[PDB]
A paper describes a structure:
Affimers are 12-kDa non-antibody scaffolds based on the cystatin fold (Tiede et al., 2014, Tiede et al., 2017), in which randomization of surface loops enables the generation of large (1010) libraries, against which epitopes can be screened and binders can be selected. To understand the observed linkage specificities, we determined crystal structures of the K6 and K33 affimers bound to their cognate diUb at 2.5 Å and 2.8 Å resolution, respectively.
Both variable loops extend the existing β strands, which leads to the formation of an intermolecular β sheet. Additionally, E76 forms a salt bridge with K6 of Ub. In contrast, the K33/K11 affimer is monomeric and only dimerizes upon diUb binding.
Residue numbers in the entry:
A (entry chain B): 32 to 120
B (entry chain C), C (entry chain A): 1 to 74
D (entry chain D): 33 to 121
């Protein structure tokens, strides 16, 4: 929800897309970010819709990826699950 | 009332229950709808493991509340 | 051989299988031992989603390998 | 790394304090031993942390056991950690 955590989620999106399509995208930066959050007491579900710039052929191009991140914690433990939901130009 | 049951990954189902109903009955509903036996269901709410003997109102599980479900694999 | 199926929490069960067995058959073993329906079982291995049609040898699931299981509530 | 172990120890202390309504003040990590399971993707870890924590205000020594399972597949990552046992020396 801050620019450091968004930077890491964007690098996650680009890396996972690269591994999913055998692409070789060079992450440049995150231009815009939109998020949907549910913040139930002791839980945080988040769908991140990040529009970032990455250079596919060496020249920058613009892609929007949506990464799902669910932070579930209970009295003894916490889970942090994240999942790349979509990558698209 | 209607409540939600989610897993650690965010998969969600919705069950119609009453605050008089017991956690055993809720787990039986999860068995009927999704097919997971109640002996495998470890239900979580308000940062607590739920005991099959107590009711939803005991744990202050109001309407439209969301629980989380972790598999036990007994 | 014996293989492991673990959940995201680290709870572990063990199934005795042969490399000829199918992911559908593995989910049938999980249903028999733990009672979770195969249609709810999304099996993970080697950073890949496992399909009910392919075999363990297709995925190079040798002896003492571990799969992961995520509940779907589909 | 010593930061990730420090954070796992603070995790153990926070979760135990929440488990017994105790108020233990994390001081430092003195000794750490772990058992690691590796695989192509997931890395399972049982941490046996010997930490220093203040009970009444004076430092005391506690041994904590944290189970940490990091499971990631193409497109996603799960990070589950769980305090399995907390006990002094």
């Amino acid at each position: 929800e801050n620019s450091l955590e968004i930077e890491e989620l964007a690098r996650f999106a680009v890396d996972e897309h690269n591994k999913k399509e055998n692409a070789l995208l060079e992450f440049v930066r995150v231009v815009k970010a939109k998020e949907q959050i549910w913040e139930m007491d002791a839980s945080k579900e988040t769908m991140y819709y990040l529009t970032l710039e990455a250079k596919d052929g060496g020249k920058k191009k613009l892609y929007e990826a949506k990464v799902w991140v669910k932070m579930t914690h209970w009295i003894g433990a916490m889970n942090n699950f994240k999942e790349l939901q979509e990558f698209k130009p | 009332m209607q409540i939600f049951v989610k897993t650690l990954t965010g998969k969600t189902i919705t069950l119609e229950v009453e605050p008089s109903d017991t956690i055993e009955n809720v787990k039986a509903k999860i068995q009927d709808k999704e097919g997971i036996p109640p002996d495998q269901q470890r239900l979580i709410f308000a940062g607590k493991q739920l005991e099959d003997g107590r009711t939803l109102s005991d744990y202050n599980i109001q309407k439209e509340s969301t629980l989380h479900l972790v598999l036990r694999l007994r």
